[PDB]
């Protein structure tokens, strides 16, 4: 075809989709961040059969837990789809900490990843 | 690099993703419309730290409120992910009126935008 | 413009987004599958004004019902956004049976489609 999508083309696409200025991801989730007022919001997707736990305290941005979480929901589980911080900015290099879970089993694994400037 | 994704490549991708024939957006939301039978459905995403309020009485497509809204939900908030009309069609140039909200500061702001033909 | 996205570029992008190795779709839904441990997870999107029913018994992968379904919700209605199998793998050619619905007129129709390797 003489031209190809890069393997991470989804980052470019979803940063545009959400008008995001930062993003963060691992093999198991991704989140696209927008700054506004004194804080920030992330639109969140699961990856690799995993998702982010909605349990309060399981997520930290620069050591601060989100003030609100919206989720997709089920009889036994729920997965983060949006999370917000009232007073913490998204910025390059700050750490998002999380528990990742999978609907396949009852596992829960600690993870962390650093925010990157949107392409 | 010789070739580049347009800044609005997400429009192309997400219209294809939902097989949408019309879409609408601002800096703060986007919605991808499919016509079917006598009405239409939009698949909805937030942008720029905002999202669409799930108050159907506050959304109007060609002056008519959707009768169904499916949402991502949380303790005190919820965001539109799909909304439908029984008897109103999506077409280019017709107006979507809506209320946009942000989890960061609990802002609620009226907006309006015109539907455009999918690329 | 010399270069163009294929009409099915959303397949490449969404498989990348969720780090999926298989996918499946019709005019009315798509689903992106990841394998992990002994089972698999699909991240699900509606198409063409339809969505996948969350009703128990309505979904089979290789003749097995999912152990969990997460949903976008509203009133008593809900649409699959993520679904999993404890013990069933995604693999090329295996059959997903489902019930597709639309909010516009409450249609509910059975269908099936075969998994395809991610590009």
Structure description:
The structure is a homotrimer of 119-residue chains. The first copy, chain A, is mainly β. In chain A, a hairpin with a 4-residue loop joins strand 6 and strand 7. Chain A has one helix at residues 9-18, and strands spanning 22-26, 29-36, 39-46, 51-52, 60-61, 68-73, 78-85, 95-101, 108-114, 116-117. Helices cover 8% and strands 46% of the residues of chain A. The first copy, chain A, has one domain. Chains in contact: A-B, A-C, B-C. Chains A and B meet through helix 1, strand 2, strand 3, strand 6 and strand 7 of A and helix 1 of B. It is classed as structural protein. Keywords: Anti-feeding prophage, Fibre foot, Cell binding, structural protein. It forms a trimeric assembly. The entry is titled "Structure of Serratia entomophila antifeeding prophage Fibre foot domain (Afp13)".
Q: Which descriptors apply to this entry?
A:
homotrimer, 119 residues, 6-stranded antiparallel beta sheet, 4-stranded antiparallel beta sheet
Strand order of the largest sheet of chain A: 6-7-3-2-1-10
**Strand-pairing-aware structural class of chain A:** mainly beta
What is the count of helical runs of chain A? Answer: 1
Distance between the termini of chain A: 24 Å
Q: What order do the helices and strands of chain A follow?
A: HEEEEEEEEEE
Percent of sequence in beta strands of chain A: over 45%
In oligomeric terms, what are we looking at? homotrimer
Largest sheet of chain A: 6 strands, antiparallel
Largest interface: A-B, 31 and 31 residues
* Shape field of chain A: globular
Subcellular location (chains A, B, C): Virion
Protein name (chains A, B, C): Afp13
């Amino acid at each position: 075809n003489g031209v190809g999508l890069k393997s991470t083309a989804w980052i470019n696409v979803m940063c545009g989709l959400h008008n995001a200025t930062f993003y963060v991801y691992s093999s198991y989730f991704c989140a696209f961040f927008c700054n506004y007022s004194n804080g920030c919001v992330a639109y969140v997707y699961g990856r690799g059969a995993f998702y982010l736990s909605t349990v309060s305290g399981d997520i930290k941005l620069n050591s601060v837990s989100p003030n609100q979480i919206l989720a997709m929901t089920g009889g036994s589980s729920s997965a983060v789809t949006m999370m917000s911080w009232t007073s913490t900015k998204a910025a390059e290099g700050i750490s998002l900490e999380y528990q990742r879970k999978s609907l396949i089993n009852s596992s829960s694994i600690s993870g962390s990843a650093s925010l990157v400037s949107a392409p």
